[PDB]
Design a protein around this ligand. Sequence first.
Ligand SMILES: Nc1ncnc2c1ncn2[C@@H]1O[C@H](COP(=O)(O)OP(=O)(O)O)[C@@H](O)[C@H]1O
Ligand SMILES: Nc1ncnc2c1ncn2[C@@H]1O[C@H](COP(=O)(O)OP(=O)(O)O)[C@@H](O)[C@H]1O
Lengths: 325, 325
Amino acid sequence: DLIYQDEHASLQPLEGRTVAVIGYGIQGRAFAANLRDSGVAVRVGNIDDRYFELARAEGHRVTNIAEAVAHADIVLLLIPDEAHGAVFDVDIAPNLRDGALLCVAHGHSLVQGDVRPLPGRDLAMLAPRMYGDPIRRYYLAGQGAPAYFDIVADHTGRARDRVLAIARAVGFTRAGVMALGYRQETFLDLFQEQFLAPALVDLVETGFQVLVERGFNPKAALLEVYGSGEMGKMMLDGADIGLDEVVALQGSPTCQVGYHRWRGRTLPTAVRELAARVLDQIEGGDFSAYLKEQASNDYASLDDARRAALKRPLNVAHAQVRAAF
Amino acid sequence: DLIYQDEHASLQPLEGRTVAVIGYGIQGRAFAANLRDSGVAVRVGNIDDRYFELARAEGHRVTNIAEAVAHADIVLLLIPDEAHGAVFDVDIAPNLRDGALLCVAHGHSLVQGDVRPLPGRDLAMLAPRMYGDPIRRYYLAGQGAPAYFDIVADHTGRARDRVLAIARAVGFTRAGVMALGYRQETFLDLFQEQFLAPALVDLVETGFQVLVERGFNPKAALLEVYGSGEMGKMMLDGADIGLDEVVALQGSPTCQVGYHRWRGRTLPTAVRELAARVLDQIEGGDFSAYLKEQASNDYASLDDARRAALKRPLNVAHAQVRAAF
Ligand SMILES: Nc1ncnc2c1ncn2[C@@H]1O[C@H](COP(=O)(O)OP(=O)(O)O)[C@@H](O)[C@H]1O
Ligand SMILES: Nc1ncnc2c1ncn2[C@@H]1O[C@H](COP(=O)(O)OP(=O)(O)O)[C@@H](O)[C@H]1O
C-alpha cells in the first residue's frame, strides 16, 4: 500500500502557479478557502448564480468557468457529476492550457466517460473521504481529511507531485493520502449508498417498530434508536478507536455483557448474500441501467420514494420529536 | 405526553439550597460545572482517589460522600451503578437531611433495588440522553441535552419543581425534559446495548467482509464502512432532520436513486423476531439472570469476548488503518 503524508509531499510544485476551482458549493468553497490560507494563488470559475456572488463577496478572483481554465495551470472540477460532461466539452477541454492538470473529487465522472484524458495534459482523482464542510474545519483545527488519489493520465511526468501539492495545500496529507483506482473508489461510494446506508436505517427502523409495537413511548423509542445522537456518536468514536473498543472503554459492565451476548449473531446469511447481490448490480452493470431509467422519468419515481419515506412511522415520530424539543 | 422547557421550569427552588454531586467522573464533572456556572451552591462528595484531587484543584468544595450528603438539600448520585447499593446504605440513607432529594441519572439502580424510597425524603430519576462530556459542551454552547425524569417518591410535595430546577440549572430544559418511568428508561438503555448496538457493528462488519472477499482494498473497505466517520456523521445529521431526509437534502441523484432501491428491503423477518427475543430477555428476566452469572466469574468470559473481538478481520484492519493515518 502507498500512503503519502506531509513529509512525503511538497508545496513547491504550486509556487508561481494558478489553481482554478470550478464550483463554489460545499466542496468548492472548502478547497478554495484552504488553498488561499496555504498561500496558493486560487481563481474561482462558476456560472452566473448565487454561488458566484458569494465567491466575489469573500474576496476570490471569480469569473465564468472558461476564463478560469484559460488562466490556470491546475483545474479542480468540484461541481455535481451531472454538469461535468457538458462543462468538460464546452469550457475545460477547449481552454485547458498545454501541460495543465485536471482533478475530480471521485471516480463517478471518469467511469461515466464524462471526463477523459487529453493529449498533452494531466488527469487525476483526489477524493477526500469526508464530503464538504469538515475539510474546512479539520484544516483550521490543524488536521485534515483522509483522501484517495489516482493518476489517470501522466502526459507531463509531473502529475503526482502537483496532485500531492494540492492534497497538502488542502490538508489531506496530514491524515494521509492513499493510492486507489478511481473505478474502485466509485464502487465503494455506490456500495455505501446502496447496501450499508439503507441497511442501517432499516435496522434503526426495525428497533423503533418493535419498541412501539410493545407499547414503548414512540418519542422515547425514536430518541434512543438515533434521535439522541448516541448511536451517531458511537459510530464516530468507533472510527477513532474501533467499534468493539468503544464498548470496552466507554461502556459499563451491564452494557459490555449485553453487547457481547448478541455481537456476531444478529444477522442471518441472507444479509451477506444481498451485500454480494448489490456489488453484482454495480460491477455487472444492472445499477448503471437502473439509474439511466430513473433519469429519463426526470427522477419522477425517486420523488415518490422521497414522499413515501416521510409517511413511515419513524419519520412521523421524528417530526413529533423535533417539534416537542 | 408531558415535556417541560425553560419557560415551564424555575431556578427559584435552588436559591439558598446546597446541591451535593456524588462522583466527579465524566457525568459528575459535567453536572458540577454547569450547576456552578448557573449560580447553584454545589458540593462534591467523592472517595480518596484521583477524581477527588481534580475536584479540589478545580475549586469545588470537596469532601467524602457522607459529609457532602449531611451538608446538602439535593443529592445527585453520579457514580457507577455497581457502587450505588453500598454508598446508598452506608453514606446516603443514614445522612440524608429530612425533606432532602436523591436523584439518579437512569433507572438501572432503582430497578435493581440498590436505591430505594426513604420515609420523609424525595427520590427521582433525571436521565440525560447524552452521556458525559456533551452535557458540558451543549451547556457552554447555549444549548442543553434532552432528558427524561420520573418522581419515584414525592414525600415533600416539592420534588417536581426541585428536579426541574436542577434539570434547568444543568441545561436539560433548553432541549426539553419528558416524563417517563425509570423502569422503561432502563429497558430502552439495555435494548440499545443488546439489539441495536451489536446489529449496527455486525452489519458494518458484513459490508467489510463482502468487500474484502471480493478483492477490495481492506484499509479502504474499513474507511468507507465507518472509518471515514461519514456513516457516523449521517446518523448524527439524521438525529436533526431524519435519516431518509439526510439522503434527500445532502445526497446526489445517483446516491438517492441507489439508497431508495434497497430502503425497507435489506432485512428478512428474522431480524424483527430477534428484536422481540431481546426484549423478552429484558422484561421476562432472562438477561437479569445472564448478567449475575458473568459477575460471579468476575466478568471472566467478558474479558474473553473483549480479546476475541480484537482478532476479527475488522479490528485487525482498524489497527492497520490508524497506524497508516
Ligand atoms: N448545471 C450546472 N452547470 C454548471 N455549474 C453548475 C451546475 N449546477 C450547479 N452548478 C454549480 O455547482 C455548485 C453546486 O454545488 P452543490 O450543489 O452544493 O454541490 P457540490 O457539493 O457537489 O458542490 C455551484 O457552484 C453551482 O453554481
Ligand atoms: N466503588 C466505588 N465507590 C465509590 N465511588 C466510586 C467507586 N468506583 C468509582 N467511584 C467514583 O465514581 C467516579 C467514576 O466515574 P467513571 O468511572 O468515569 O464513571 P461515570 O461516567 O459513571 O461517572 C469517580 O468519582 C470515582 O471516584
